Amino acid sequence: GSELSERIESFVETLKRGGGPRSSEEMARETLGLLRQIITDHRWSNAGELMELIRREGRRMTAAQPSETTVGNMVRRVLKIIREEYGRLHGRQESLHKLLTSDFSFHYAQLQSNIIEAINELLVELEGTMENIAAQALEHIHSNEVIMTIGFSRTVEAFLKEAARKRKFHVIVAECAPFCQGHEMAVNLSKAGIETTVMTDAAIFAVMSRVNKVIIGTKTILANGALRAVTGTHTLALAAKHHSTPLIVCAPMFKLSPQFPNEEDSFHKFVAPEEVLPFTEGDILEKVSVHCPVFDYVPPELITLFISNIGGNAPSYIYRLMSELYHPDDHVL
Amino acid sequence: GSELSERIESFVETLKRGGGPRSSEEMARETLGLLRQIITDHRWSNAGELMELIRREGRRMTAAQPSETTVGNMVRRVLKIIREEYGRLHGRQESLHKLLTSDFSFHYAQLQSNIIEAINELLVELEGTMENIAAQALEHIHSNEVIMTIGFSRTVEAFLKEAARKRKFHVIVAECAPFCQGHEMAVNLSKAGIETTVMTDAAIFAVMSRVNKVIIGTKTILANGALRAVTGTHTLALAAKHHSTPLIVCAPMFKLSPQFPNEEDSFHKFVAPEEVLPFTEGDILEKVSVHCPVFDYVPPELITLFISNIGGNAPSYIYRLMSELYHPDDHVL
Incomplete structure (x- = not known):
């Protein structure tokens, strides 16, 4: 009740003011824990009330920081899990087959336990994602290869560190200006014995x-296979x-x-111009427009392969994965 | 003279039957020497008779083996030299300037010596072409580079040998089947300490x-910057x-x-099918058509740079280099 409200408010304020969970996996874990607490503590009778409550909470969290898509992804995953459990406990996707060959008000006592155990299984699968991704490093890196990276991606760091245990290669890291986080990646990789270059x-x-x-890593993957990555990608x-x-x-x-690149003017994250042009410039700052977008849009045709905890895939298949994770009615949220 | 006629006949028969001068520089030297002997021994009152007789001899040599463009290039160079000598001794290109602004057979008793000394200067410049090309190796090869070559080219071999004196790099050589002359290139480059791969x-x-x-090397360079190279290029x-x-x-x-790629079905050199399909195949050779083209046409848009004894040029400039060497009236020959 009160504790849940305080947790929700703290999460919303942390999202609005930035900071908090540096790791994307940590943010996903916190979102899943918050949703689990909402399901456990809040009172609901049928699946419709729970879905509406989750929709309202996810709308609030998404409006808190639209650039953090992980929270909305977790909300939609929980909604899809709830839909699947309700369909399994009550009954028995849009396609030509469904088009040709032709109600959440019911209440069940064991639905909540099924939802909670499904959420716990999702969290367990989330804990081992990085190792699953890094286990495929040897299949993609050969001897004396040259690898190029931008910024600081923890998944790419794990990938390269796992690959370096058995192969020798070179890694080039570009400092993602202005927040030159590529220096940290370069020094971390050099500490592991990999020969690295800073540029x-x-x-x-x-x-x-x-x-x-x-x-490279990414912040978001769109429904068409496009990327929301760091600027310069x-x-x-x-x-x-x-x-x-x-x-x-x-x-x-x-x-x-499951969003599409139709949305505009909210895609990139705009931060204070101090990162690009310092406040000490003086009078010229009065008549100069300074814009500092944090994120960049990458069309799907520039991406060759996606490596995730389930393996390798082409961008042209991304839609199918997006069909397996989210219901089409939850895209608007 | 009888000796000159027998030399011309021997050259023509050697061209027709193949073999003879293995290197292109040696063939150019032999052609220039033959043309000089023709000019000295033959009796010509004026420049017109000399030009027509040289054109007849060049027609014979070109018809002996069309794929050997070096002989025709030498004939046209000698014709241009004769034209420029006659113009300088007697008088004082098509362009908009000439169009807006707008006669041989005049004996001068001194043209022969000028022609002979110009031919000797051309031969002297020809002697040092390979070293001039190889002197630019260090400007185009950096440390730990990977170079790809096809077949066996003397100029590329000199280039790589000169570059290897100060730099370490890797060279990949593709065997130009069926005449797998790339093996000789790989062995020769390995003799010089360069690390080489055969494939x-x-x-x-x-x-x-x-x-x-x-x-890569080439057999011929066309007026538009296109290449006649070995098959597979x-x-x-x-x-x-x-x-x-x-x-x-x-x-x-x-x-x-100065020829253009309009010519067809004589560009490639077709040799006996034995090199591709052996005679021991038997009955199937009766109903199987096998063709073995020796040369290949490379469009100019696939070439980045031309390195010659005068330096580096783009293909789009080749026409100018072609206008400086040959008169437009001698293209047909």
Whole structure:
């Protein structure tokens, strides 16, 4: 009751003010725990009331920070789990087969336990996602390869660290300006014995002719296979496509969002201009427009392969995965 | 004279039957020497008779073996030299300037010596073409590069041997089947300490993703910048273009031919089918048509740079280099 309300308010304020869970997996775990607490503590009779309550809470959390798609993905996953459990306990996707060959008000006592155990199984699968992704490193990295990365991705770091246990290769890291988090990735990889190079994004094209493949992380994966990545990733993808360099996206399954790139002006995250132009510039700041987008849109045609905890896939198959995780009626939320 | 006629007949029969000068430079030297002997021994009152007799001899030599463009190039170079000598001694290109602004057979008793000394200067410049081309190796090869070659080219071998004196790199050689002369190139490069790999042409597209640049020779350079190279070079150029891999053609200036790719069905050299399908196959040879083209046509858009004894040029500039060497009236010959 009161404790749940305080937790929800704290989560919303943390999302609004930034910070909090640095790891995306940690944020997904916290969202799943909050949803589990909402299901346990709040009073509901049938599946419809629970779905409406979850929809309202997910709407609030999404409006708190629209750029954090993991919270909305978790809300939609919980809604799909609830729908599946209700259909299994009560009854027995849109397609041509369904079109040709032709009510959540009922209450069941054991529905809540099934929902809770399904959520617990989802959390358990979430805990082992990084190791599952990293276990496929050897199938994609050969001897004396050159790998190009941008920013600081923990999944890519685990990928490269696992691959380095048995193979020798070179890794080039571009500092994702202004927040040059690529330096941390470079020093972490160098601490593991991998030979690493530090360079600015301005050189991404220049060295791209000597890169064998590109391995990057992402913030969100759209329904068409497009990426919401860190800024400068679109340029890296274009440079890789210019040289036909394969581009690999190491992204967990919980970063898939059933949204489409139709939305505008809310995609990129705009932060204070101080990161790009310091306040000490003076008078010229009065008549200069400074914009600092944090995220970038990458079209699906620039992506070669998606590596997730379930294996490797092409972007053209992403829709099917998105059909297996989310109900089409929960896209609007 | 009888000796000159017998030399011309021997040259023509050697061209018709194949073999003879293994290197292109040796064939150019022999053609220039034959033309000089023709000019000295034959009796001509004026420049017109000399030009017509040289045209007749060049027609005979070209008809002896059309695929050997070096002989015709030498004939046209000598004709242009004669034209320029006569114009300088007697008088003082098509362009808009000439169009807006707007006669041989005049004996001068001094043209022969000028022609002979110009031919001698051309031969002297020809002697040092290979070293001039190889002197530019260090400007195009960096440390730990990967180079891809096809067949056996003397100029590329000199290029790589000169570059290896100061730099360490990897060279991949594709055997130009059926005449697997790439084995000789690989062995020779390994004798110089360069690390080399032997592979078939079927693997070209398989390995171009790990190649930094492609350095190849050619048999002929066309007026539009196109190439007549060994069979299999077109697919190599297409694979390099697929990966935006720069393609460098190391070819001396005497391989430029003012002809255009309009000519068809005589471009490639067709040899006995024994090289592709052995005679021991038996009955199936009765109803099987097997063709063995020796040369391939490479469009100019697949070539990045031409390296010759005068430096580096783009294909789009080839026409100018072609206008500086040959008169437009001698293209038909």
